[PDB]
Amino acid sequence: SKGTASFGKKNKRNTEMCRRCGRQSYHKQKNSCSSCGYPNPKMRNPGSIKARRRRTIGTGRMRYMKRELRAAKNGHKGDPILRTLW
Amino acid sequence: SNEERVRRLASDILNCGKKKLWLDNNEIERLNGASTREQIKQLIKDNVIIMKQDKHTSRGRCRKRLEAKKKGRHMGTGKRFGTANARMPQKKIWMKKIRAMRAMLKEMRANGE
């Protein structure tokens, strides 16, 4: 009875949503995410060659880094009001 | 049809089963258009909705067999299936006999005999 009949017992859930990366891979009995490695301060080394291009710089929105790149083409002049103090 | 909404509301108000309700076949236009609990209660006062009765099994031929064996009628050797202890335990006939004869001795002593 290790086949069909054993599948009817699988109603416990070991994981929850991770608060760093958002996958269903934060193991609650272990206190550890298997994707990103939270709560270690550094992020985990990816497990495959393709895994590196699914979550990196550029696969999200880049809300601040785009702005900074437009400012470095013009010498980083800031708000025209505050320019008197500087 | 409105039949499914009337049997769900009327069965809750009357506290019965959905099949024990009678819906007057000749008032299909009153039955179509109730829609509220207050209108269902008016059709129950006007006898447009009626509640049937339950079967209650009779005990008449079971009461005749109980007063026949009070005279000893169905108790012979061919009618016993438990053992003598299962149908009249011996520890309980012992308790009843010595509580009664411990009571006589207590009042024969109180009277001087």
């Binding site: - | 069965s11 809750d12 506290n15 019965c16 089963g17």
Partner: protein, 100 residues
């Protein structure tokens, strides 16, 4: 929809989940909650009963007057009257052998 029992909460049969059955005035049958059982008070020396102190759980017990929570004499919350007499006689007779 005749003949049902009304039950609220969890169904496990533990010390803190006992229920009775009752017929309400409108004809319904309900499985109702009973207070948690509390035991009798005993003497701490001979294990005799102290029948006057109240039988309550510790939070409701503390909201009662002191006349409910003890007997009016020394050690009145824990000891029996017969074990207190012997404890006084033993204390007095001891001091007489040491001043001699």
């Amino acid at each position: 929809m005749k003949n049902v029992l009304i039950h609220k909460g969890a169904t496990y049969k533990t010390r803190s989940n006992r229920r009775r059955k009752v017929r309400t005035p409108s004809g319904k049958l309900v499985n109702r909650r009973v207070k948690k059982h509390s035991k009798k008070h005993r003497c701490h020396e001979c294990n005799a009963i102290l029948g006057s102190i109240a039988r309550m759980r510790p939070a409701e017990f503390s909201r009662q007057k002191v006349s409910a929570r003890r007997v009016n004499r020394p050690y009145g919350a824990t000891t029996c009257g017969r074990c207190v007499r012997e404890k006084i006689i033993s204390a007095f007779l001891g001091n007489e052998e040491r001043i001699v």
